[PDB]
């Protein structure tokens, strides 16, 4: 799987029912995050702060899906441990992949992936990290609003950027009479190719 | 043989020319944690703030004991122009090689032939952590920085950093340790048994 492939569709049971990922999605921005067993701890942290994040997810109208290949009975039983014991609500989908159908699917045949998917289908971020090392939630949002505000404008968000800091011009877009139009508030050209512009509202 | 590197595989050695010299990665590197960053061409506006904000970090990668390379397909001569606008235009001067990849052999043999990576390389060589962000959207250093706190720590005692975790929060014992006297030696300051799976103890000195 590749960044711009389309994420596969699939059709499988789930902590919340059957889930068919194309149709469950809709029009939505998707989460996909895999776990590699169920009962182990950076996980249960993990799926604590994605069920705290629930409002942060829908003001960006993002659907987010959780998967391992343990049973349903298991997701379910795991569910409780979360919910108590990082004082939350398990409010979206845990996918029991137990024939590896999804697993296989993704190519995630102890590291977890977790995939961004765009109203498209489209794979947009693949970040894979260790057994060792738990997830930065705050990283995830600021992806998301950097994709999110890079697709509705030619913008692309500089290092360490947070939403509400300057952007600079695509490079592609070089049609000066076009950059005029699409960006009201101004810009600087500090270099040929480093065009600085508030970010577009 | 060149392929995409995954979690664990060694990352492979090579001699390049750079903006600091000849340079041959595992010599260089040492026994010291490396990172090296991969930038598709010279003078793009993301990939300056980029090499901005890393030369910025000059303090706190060395604080850590790690080696910073950058790698583009684009000539020293180039490289140097670059350097010029990125110390200037990022209040900053890049203290570190730019490998001047023009023959492509570098990029051919990590296998990145619009997206960057950067790879996190341990001092046995391994590939620790990938990130691969698209062309649209900036790194976050304070986030690689944190990462290499993460597996500095795991690696010298027998623990995982929860979701979340910044330097001296609580964190978790590996699921692989559960030989309670080997856990009562390691881990003289104790523990919490949330659930059987789930041991909280206070960050090792």
């Known amino acids: 799987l590749r960044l711009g492939d389309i994420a596969p ?17 809709g029009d939505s921005w998707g989460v996909l995050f895999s776990h590699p067993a169920d009962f182990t701890p950076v ?9 705290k994040l629930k409002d942060q997810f829908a003001q960006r109208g993002v659907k987010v899906l959780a998967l391992s290949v343990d049973p349903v009975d298991s997701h379910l039983k795991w569910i409780d441990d979360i ?26 045949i102890t590291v977890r992936s977790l995939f961004i998917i765009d109203p498209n289908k489209k794979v947009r971020l693949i970040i894979t990290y260790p057994a060792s090392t738990g997830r930065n939630f705050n990283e995830i949002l600021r992806v998301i609003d950097s994709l999110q ?8 968000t500089p290092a360490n950027w947070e939403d509400g800091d300057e952007v600079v011009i695509v490079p592609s877009l070089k049609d000066e009479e076009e950059i005029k139009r699409r960006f009201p508030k101004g810009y600087r050209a500090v270099k040929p190719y480093l065009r600085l512009t508030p970010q577009p509202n």
Do not use: M
Request: glycine share 4%; with cysteine.
């Open 9 to 25: 569709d699939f059709e499988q049971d789930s902590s919340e029912g059957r889930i068919r990922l194309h149709e469950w999605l």
């Open 83 to 108: 919910n108590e014991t990082q004082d939350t609500r398990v409010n979206f989908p845990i996918i029991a992949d137990a024939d590896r159908k999804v697993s296989e699917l993704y190519d995630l």
């Open 149 to 156: 505000l890079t697709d509705e404008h030619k913008v692309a």
């Open 43 to 51: 996980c249960t942290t993990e799926l604590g702060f994605t069920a």
